[PDB]
Subunit: 359 residues, 4 copies
């Protein structure tokens, strides 16, 4: 349905940064700097520019004060200056609105293209960026919960196959997905950089941003973030986890920022860089697909996500999903999940695993 | 109202082993040896004797084939042979049924006393035991989920203060407890060996055995147990966790054996051996008391526990708790819990944390 | 000095496997399978095919029984079948000897090109491989010391700049190197897959294979390999480490197999896939460059390395390095190293660090 | 030959703190607070009082400014107030010089006895201490290298059997030791609290303090200390390790403070609380006894240790060991070690 352009796709390296609009800059700074330990590249009254421990580009996260909390841009770094021109030509052929600024939208980025993509998401493509001190061996700064890299984005969109085809044409390869036996796709993960993903599509009303993910070196680092949140008496901001994912095999945690933007902390997924990397499809009823240990997925994880902005800074209208809901088919009234395919024992009918039901 | 005897209490070193009755020895062997990796000290068609990686006494766990799965004995090692005689005189003065075997009740234990204690529990006291090869440096055998020590037992009993007084007279010192503002005690932890506990009392219908706990060296060892259970497609036997406890500060997991006996895997609590070790009392509505990260306690954790046997091998009758239920006051339809005392933000009314209600 | 071909370079994805000739297949099996826990994809009385925990291609390591212990092939996977034709045309234009087999040289590999490259190393390029069960979630098999991926090779070669230019034309990017203030290069690391390296050049007499490196998930996994080696009373096969590397920032261990083939266990380097990834150059006298904690590098690590074979299976003649020796300039009799640049305190004259 | 008093021994709970004299308080503070992340219980211009993450007593370490860097006191907590009276009567009977301060020698400690013990070491015994906030769940303060408990001391003394018997009389039990076939004891580890040790005796010239040890939760915490020292470009102050010990089975690291006091960071030894805990004896020539991975023990680890003070603050005179030297019999010119007993492959001679 989204046609393959004749113009060549830009060569995308990786997810690079997200610009999030936040309502109280000081409160958000306390979360991202004082709680999570991200490193300040620049700040003023209106914006905070943050980077992870191993990053050498100017930032992985820009926090921009505004009236309505939202994703303003998810940004991908491209291989060459010329790929920014390629991006503009490709999205113009797709019929999308685009904006080009030769000196960047945010500080520390040069020539950049922002687009309203066909799924309603504000993507940025850039090559030029101000390099900064790469802090990877600054163990004098290293925190017990240190965030070392930006890893991925996760986007909520109503029609996953439509989005998946478009991202494949753009050069992302699907590594894993969740489907059922009736033709429905609930989620797909897709990459450029050779990890399980750079972005992912989650079926639901959208466009909305599900989360931004940062990695740690080790599992104990994620444990420490939880432990610190308990010490700060903000354990109510731990949404889900910690856990082992089935999809991706990573150890993970989901937490919520002061504007309810969801952040994932993630570690130890696998290499996907080979072009015939085997695609893994999980059945939506498999209770080990999202949490390998079977722990239930809280309903807010399926229903809540961040607004996204258009190029004018207005909120994008939400389009309802008409395909089946993962929540409904797994933990809802008519839901079903299994631990062992075909075994009634360890199965759940109309409720979540481990003795819980939907609140 | 359990009187303090005139006879001197035995000097108790530590929890040493449990004897659990199991209905299918081979299935229980698969769980304890093949899944959990405990080391066999002796086995035949009737029993399997198991020890942890660091142990030098003959065993920490005896699995005994029988018709009805239950706790048959929870054993404490005493400091000298003469302390077994002290235990005998002590329980005789309490008016408890005792049985003394100069030869032992199980293999690898010598002179031993079993008693039906005033809370209905089968306690064993012994000094003499057959030493075995201490495996602590056998890294050729070490598994990714290695269980290194037996840490503690946890007992369900209807009246926590009655039991705690009796354990205090036996020499156990309370480290932590859970109470409400109108004077109900829900749980207490108490020790002899300088950790948070050797045994613990959980308010509920009793006598029942809540769990037996083993330690690991590190937190990743507990994560591996979960990961392994997912790979074996037995994630439905992971009851609760992993997590960080509030009480004890230990990293933990609860799993269920083939007869539903609950096993805890635990690591990294703190030193309590000083006699003025500061006690910690938690409020029952504090949602960080059990899981520090605020994750909900699954209802089965509060309701399900193993039968216990009397000295004839018959199941002890259960007495109902009349004080308030922890489940009901925290996650039940009339329950409540808080993240920050006094704050409605992050508080839960009539349901569990994180968005679940009771299934 | 090695010219850049007009023919396009093959698109190389990553290092994929090594073929090692070993002299006692049973002793080598005990080391790589029983001690290190690698997984057997295939075996017979002449060869063992092994793979790491997260691999889906047929193997990462082939142990081949033979009379002389040596590297027989270092193999890189290329992006398409057509890239094996590109590699062929490229090495022909370099004037290198090549051999192409549509059915592969070893089991589980299809159409493959082997070459004696300009530095005397036996390189293999392939696309086609037999997929196997990816064991990445088989935590029922997971060892406390589990090796999860093949990470890189390290090659000993007398002239590093000469080598570096050749690998860069082949599409490898230098991420880190070791130089001095007198124009000598002692080592360079270079990548395709976006980690610090897929191969590396260590200045010394060659061609010889320094080591093959496998990864673990976490640092405790490397600690366990050491602990296990102590329990098996084979701690004498631990050569160096464990440690933190300066170059790469990875946590590491060097151990020796039964034929003295050196294996590195490695974890937690950083992302290098951006094209302007900043290059890091260490000074050869910086005593934190190889072991970040300043632990001394044992002379065997500099002097010992594996023989390599040509396409006929004969040992390649060793060419002597005439540029300065990293050993001599840092820990030899007239050696020097520093902890802090310009500070006499914490410096070492004519001896290794730490006593 | 140290006679056992008739007076009963105090009941010692555990090693509790050390008082180290340091020459530059600000440099020392940098090391112990900014590098190692110990928590300040009290400070002024003459002393810094520090504690570990899980401690509730006032401190584990006192840094006192003075002209000569030395150990001033190694303090053990006793079970009751009356055990301080017992310690006084005990050491008086031993013929040792003692000093009782009913209000303590350092802040945060109450009634305390200091003694010049029969091996020349300044021991303190106290019960009363000011309790402080136990930081064990303050994960907002937790460092990647966090020191969680004080674990033990290690004393260098010339005659190990002589000091071992004295410590056994005091209620310490030996858990491990190092011996040769000829009957020489080179080291012994002994405990009260149910870990491998609260103190240890190293054969060498003494009295000198070999080290004070702190524990971490996990091995990665020790790795981080090393990584941090690399980043601060003070890797020259890493003396030995990190490693797995043979004796104790603990993961370890040894580092040097600005006055060359040696600090060990230590984790994951085993339980010794049972009275028939099996004692392990290693052969001095076994190359896995000290570092299990067979890494060499740098000679400075055997020859360097801190001076100790007497009760007047003067340096205690040193007595030179006449028994065989572990350095000499293993890495000296006529020394040797093995990986596997009886096997020349993996053995080391004069090296
Ligand atoms: O916080 N609780 O759930 C606890 C704390 C420690 C335990 O050993 C336990 O079984 C429960
Ligand atoms: O710093 N060096 O010693 C290095 C760095 C990375 C390596 O993989 C290696 O084999 C050596
Ligand atoms: O094996 N040794 O070298 C040891 C073992 C334990 C220790 O605490 C120590 O300081 C030295
Ligand atoms: Ca269906
Ligand atoms: Cl998920
Ligand atoms: Fe994600
Ligand atoms: Fe427990
Ligand atoms: Fe390497
Ligand atoms: Fe020590």
């Amino acid at each position: 349905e989204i046609p393959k352009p004749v113009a060549p796709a830009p060569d995308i390296l990786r997810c690079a940064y997200a610009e999030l609009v936040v309502t109280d800059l000081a409160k958000s700074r306390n979360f991202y700097v004082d709680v999570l330990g991200l490193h300040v590249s620049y700040e003023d009254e209106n914006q905070i520019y943050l980077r992870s421990f191993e990053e050498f580009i100017h930032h992985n996260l820009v926090l921009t004060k505004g009236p309505v909390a939202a994703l303003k841009a998810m940004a991908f770094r491209v291989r060459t200056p010329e790929d920014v021109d390629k991006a503009e030509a490709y999205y113009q052929e797709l019929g999308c609105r685009t904006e080009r600024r030769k000196d960047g939208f945010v500080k520390g980025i040069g020539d950049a293209l922002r687009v309203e993509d066909p799924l309603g998401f504000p993507y940025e493509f850039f090559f030029e960026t101000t390099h900064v001190e790469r802090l990877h061996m600054r163990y004098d700064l290293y925190s017990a919960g240190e965030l070392v890299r930006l890893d991925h984005f996760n986007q909520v969109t109503p029609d996953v196959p439509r989005g998946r085809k478009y991202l494949e044409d753009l050069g992302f390869r699907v590594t894993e997905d969740i489907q059922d036996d009736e033709g429905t796709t609930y989620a797909a993960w897709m990459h450029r950089k050779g990890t399980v993903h750079d972005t992912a599509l989650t079926g639901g009303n959208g466009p909305r941003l599900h989360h931004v993910a940062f990695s740690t070196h080790e599992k104990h680092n994620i444990i420490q973030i939880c432990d610190k949140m308990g010490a700060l008496r903000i354990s109510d901001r731990i949404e889900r986890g910690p856990g082992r994912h089935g999809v991706s095999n990573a150890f993970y945690l989901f937490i919520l920022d002061p504007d309810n933007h969801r952040i994932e902390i993630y570690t130890q997924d696998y290499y996907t860089g080979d072009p015939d990397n085997p695609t893994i499809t999980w059945n939506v009823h498999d209770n080990q697909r999202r949490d390998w240990w079977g722990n239930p997925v809280v309903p807010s994880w399926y229903t809540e996500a961040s607004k996204v902005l258009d190029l004018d800074g207005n909120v994008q209208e939400i389009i309802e999903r008409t395909d089946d809901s993962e929540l409904e088919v797994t933990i809802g009234a008519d839901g079903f999940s299994f631990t062992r395919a075909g075994d009634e024992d360890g199965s759940y009918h109309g409720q979540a695993s481990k003795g819980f039901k939907l609140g």
